[PDB]
Design an enzyme around this catalytic site. Structure first.
Site, PDB file in Angstrom:
ATOM      1  N   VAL A   1       1.243  -2.811   8.665  1.00 23.92           N
ATOM      2  CA  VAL A   1       0.991  -1.848   7.738  1.00 23.92           C
ATOM      3  C   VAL A   1       1.225  -0.434   8.225  1.00 23.92           C
ATOM      4  CG1 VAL A   1      -1.444  -1.423   8.050  1.00 23.92           C
ATOM      5  CG2 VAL A   1      -0.275  -1.110   5.840  1.00 23.92           C
ATOM      6  N   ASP A   2       0.870  -0.178   9.581  1.00 23.05           N
ATOM      7  CA  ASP A   2       1.320   1.138  10.283  1.00 23.05           C
ATOM      8  C   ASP A   2       2.518   1.115  10.286  1.00 23.05           C
ATOM      9  OD1 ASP A   2       0.012   3.330  12.175  1.00 23.05           O
ATOM     10  OD2 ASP A   2       1.965   2.413  12.939  1.00 23.05           O
TER      11      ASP A   2
ATOM     12  N   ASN B   1      -2.687   2.603  15.099  1.00 20.90           N
ATOM     13  CA  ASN B   1      -2.969   2.351  16.651  1.00 20.90           C
ATOM     14  C   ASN B   1      -3.773   3.501  17.191  1.00 20.90           C
ATOM     15  OD1 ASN B   1      -1.409  -0.192  16.225  1.00 20.90           O
ATOM     16  ND2 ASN B   1       0.220   1.469  15.768  1.00 20.90           N
TER      17      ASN B   1
ATOM     18  N   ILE C   1       0.821  -1.125  -0.097  1.00 23.49           N
ATOM     19  CA  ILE C   1      -0.143   0.108   0.118  1.00 23.49           C
ATOM     20  C   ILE C   1       0.866   1.434  -0.145  1.00 23.49           C
ATOM     21  CG2 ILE C   1      -0.348   0.501   2.637  1.00 23.49           C
ATOM     22  CD1 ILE C   1      -3.148   0.898   1.752  1.00 23.49           C
TER      23      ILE C   1
END
Ligand SMILES: Nc1ncnc2c1ncn2[C@@H]1O[C@H](COP(=O)(O)OP(=O)(O)O)[C@@H](O)[C@H]1O
Length: 190
Positions: free
Chosen positions: A44-45, A35, A22
Site C-alpha cells: 500500500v505504501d 515504513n 485506498i
C-alpha cells in the site's frame, strides 16, 4: 467491478468498510502504512507513492531529516504530509508493528496507529479519513486479530469523539469478509 461495503452510524459519526484501492479515496485524509525509514516500498505504501507522485518521498525525507533528526518514525506514531497527486488533502503516515517483534506491546502499538491518526483528524478539524489494513501484509499481523484491534479502537474513538466519516479500505474480498464478520460482531455488543 463490484465493491462490497457496509456502514454503521456511531452517534454523529459513520464507520464504513469497503473493498477498494485506498489511493482512489476522496476522503480528507488517507493513511499510509509506512515504513519506519519513510522510504517508499511495495504494498500500500508503494501504491500511495506511485499515485501521489515523486513529491511525497521528498516531503517525507525532509521531515525525517528535520523534525525526526534522522530517526525512524516510531511504531504507532504518526506524521502528516500533503496528499500531492492523491485525491485526498493529507496523508497520515504511520508505522504498524511487525508481527511478534514485540509481543507484549504490539496490540497497544497497533491501536496507537488508529488513535493517533484519529486525534490528528480532530485537531485539524478534518471530517473524513480512510485507513488500510495496517500491518497485515508483509508485516505479518494476523488479519483476524488486527481487524479486531482496528475496529475496537475506531469504534471506541467514535463513541467518545465527533469525527465524521471513517473508512477502512480492504484490498481483497477475504480481508473485507473478515472485517465484515468482526464489525457485525462488535456492533452486536454496543
Ligand atoms: N492500493 C491499496 N489500497 C488498499 N490497501 C492495499 C493496497 N495495496 C495493498 N494493500 C493492503 O494493505 C495491507 C497492508 O499491507 P502492507 O502494505 O504490506 O502493509 P504492512 O507492511 O503494514 O503489512 C494489506 O492488506 C495489503 O493487501
Amino acid at each position: 467491478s463490484h465493491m462490497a461495503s457496509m456502514k454503521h452510524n456511531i452517534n454523529d459519526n459513520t464507520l464504513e468498510i469497503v473493498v477498494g484501492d485506498i489511493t482512489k479515496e476522496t476522503t480528507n485524509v488517507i493513511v499510509n502504512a509506512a515504513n519506519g525509514s519513510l522510504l517508499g516500498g511495495g504494498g500500500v505504501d508503494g501504491a500511495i507513492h506511485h499515485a501521489a507522485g515523486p513529491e511525497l518521498l521528498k516531503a517525507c525525507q525532509e521531515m525525517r531529516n528535520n523534525e525526526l533528526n534522522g530517526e525512524e518514525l516510531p511504531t504507532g506514531e504518526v506524521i502528516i504530509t500533503s496528499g500531492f497527486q492523491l485525491p485526498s488533502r493529507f496523508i497520515i503516515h504511520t508505522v504498524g508493528p511487525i508481527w511478534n517483534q514485540t509481543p507484549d506491546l504490539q496490540e497497544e502499538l497497533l491501536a496507537n496507529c488508529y488513535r493517533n491518526a484519529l486525534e490528528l483528524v480532530k485537531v485539524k478539524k478534518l471530517s473524513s479519513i480512510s485507513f488500510p489494513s495496517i500491518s497485515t501484509g508483509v508485516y505479518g499481523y494476523p488479519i483476524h486479530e488486527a481487524a479486531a484491534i482496528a475496529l475496537q479502537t475506531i469504534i471506541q474513538f467514535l463513541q467518545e469523539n465527533d469525527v465524521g466519516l471513517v473508512k477502512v479500505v480492504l484490498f481483497s474480498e477475504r480481508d473485507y469478509s473478515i472485517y465484515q464478520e468482526k464489525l457485525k460482531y462488535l456492533i452486536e455488543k454496543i
